Amino acid sequence: MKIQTNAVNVLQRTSAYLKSGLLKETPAWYNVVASIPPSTKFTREPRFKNPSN
Amino acid sequence: QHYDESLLSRYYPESLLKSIKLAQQTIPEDTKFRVSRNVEFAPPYLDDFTKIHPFWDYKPGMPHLHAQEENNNFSIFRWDQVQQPLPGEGNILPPGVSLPNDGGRKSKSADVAAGLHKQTGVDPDYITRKLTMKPLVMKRVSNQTGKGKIASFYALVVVGDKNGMVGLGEGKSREEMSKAIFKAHWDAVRNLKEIPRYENRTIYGDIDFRYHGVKLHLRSAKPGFGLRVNHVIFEICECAGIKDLSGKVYKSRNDMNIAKGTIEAFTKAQKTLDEVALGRGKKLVDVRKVYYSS
Amino acid sequence: LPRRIVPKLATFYSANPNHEDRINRLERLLRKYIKLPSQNNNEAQQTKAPWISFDEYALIGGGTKLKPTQYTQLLYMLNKLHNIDPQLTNDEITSELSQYYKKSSMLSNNIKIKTLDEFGRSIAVGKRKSSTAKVFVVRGTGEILVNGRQLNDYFLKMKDRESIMYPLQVIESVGKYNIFATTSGGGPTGQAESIMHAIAKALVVFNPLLKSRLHKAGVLTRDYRHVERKK
């Protein structure tokens, strides 16, 4: 499945609603998500050692 | 209970006192009244029957089966109005319903703004005042069924505030084209998106985007260049707030797919200077803007 | 100080928030009183379970959203709480269950115990086809009169006479009662079986413990078959 973009950018899409005025009131989650950014890299990571042996 | 004439004469009219006196001399005080469970003679509410109700009683002077006046003594000589208006407030408006006093003052934009606010929480004022709607495709489609060809109206519209926010909406209705446009206007507001704009007038660089069979080649333009693009792209740029743009469409020139392709290109094919700088850890300078700075 | 609008029920986002909230309240009681023993007279099948009807519960349990299986789940928990030992039950359980008990107390029944009249006679009416019969049963020695005439005179068919005797044969009281039967309408078969039905209904006053045997024999059931206009 394609790497989704819209689930991790709710803060940025919401911020456009507030700046334009389409959304009058800031949501309660808005401040919490802004202070705790989601991880949005979704990359494959190399590994150089077998942790067991 | 039997009451003295004095008491009864302070509540009931004199004309009715004789009847009350005769009834209190014929019905013994120890009468045990029984309730009839076959025939309901009296009304379901209490009533002394001393006053004639203007609505629930027969109108005095009107002819009817139980009219007591002689046929030459009726007093209804005007027949242009309803004789017995409704009682009380004068209406039977169901609780929770409003009198349709004004019709045609309803605005499809205001109907979209009210419904969307209740369904999604968007501000009605912004929709009814800040947004501009432009139909892009309006055609009739048909489905072949056993009963016969069923026609439907298809409407593709674009909405935007001319300040970066633009949305595309589609709507279908078997009844009329106006209903299809209302649904498309409703859908477009729900799909509103922000598009990056360089200096709030144009796009960042050039875009070569493929949306299905549509090949879109969009080039950024100098200030005052204007919109020199396919007519479908022109309308979207107007709503989105793009003022300067050049470009060509190759292969498929289907209006519907050009509009969707353009919206997709403006979001998925652009990168702001700020986003490029942060990703690369470099400073990007607009030479033209620096040349006119202090 | 600042005020906000929030869903009333914790189950707001469920399919039937009203039913789920009620089930949760009952489930809490069944958890808090898990240890309380249940009635051992439940084996004796205590005849107490006046629970509200599915339609009545739909007023409080989501209306159209209410599903039959959801109503079945409410009854399984209402009965389990109800079947807790009466001595060891508490107010909390009874209060919660009170809201689910059907209410038909404002009105009363219309049935008055049947008793023998001033002359020791049990009077019952019976109907079969177009015939009707009013019988007077008294304690006696087996004497029968039909419309003032001897049984063999009025009813020529022995099968009709045997039908009249059958209810008395079931309770083995053929020689213990005198019957004065009066009948009108229909024919011999309708009248004989209308008398049969009326004797069975009149014999219950003398010993109400034999009603079950009369019902099982089929003599207390009114035959509904009548001539039907062809359609």
Added chain:
Amino acid sequence: KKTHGYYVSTRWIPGTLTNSTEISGIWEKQEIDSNDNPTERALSPNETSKQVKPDLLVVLNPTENR
């Protein structure tokens, strides 16, 4: 219960959030103060039809809740 939140354990009705007015409009809302105590103020029919959207959704089994 311990977060003064909400839960759904039986079935997520498709459209609960996007079609909230046709699914959740009939259910009752309430006004509460900063202490989460019911204010008891009667709500206008306008306030009782507005979508009440969750601020945060926690999903235990996302593979079955696409």
Added chain:
RNA sequence: AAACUCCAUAUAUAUAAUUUUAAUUAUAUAUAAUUUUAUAUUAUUUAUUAAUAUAAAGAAAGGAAUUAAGACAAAUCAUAAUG
């Protein structure tokens, strides 16, 4: 649409100065069932379940009306009506 219903059936109340007598009746109103309950067995998706039997309770066992669409350009210009 089903149904709700109306009819039939069972019962209750009211009415009849029981010679308009059929009071074993007449006809108004209301009630009742789409029956219910437990028990063993057999299957199950085994559960807050079905198919059976069994005991218990009950008078309780039957009908109705109407239409949603479309076809036969089926009958009727002689039931009447129109070009």
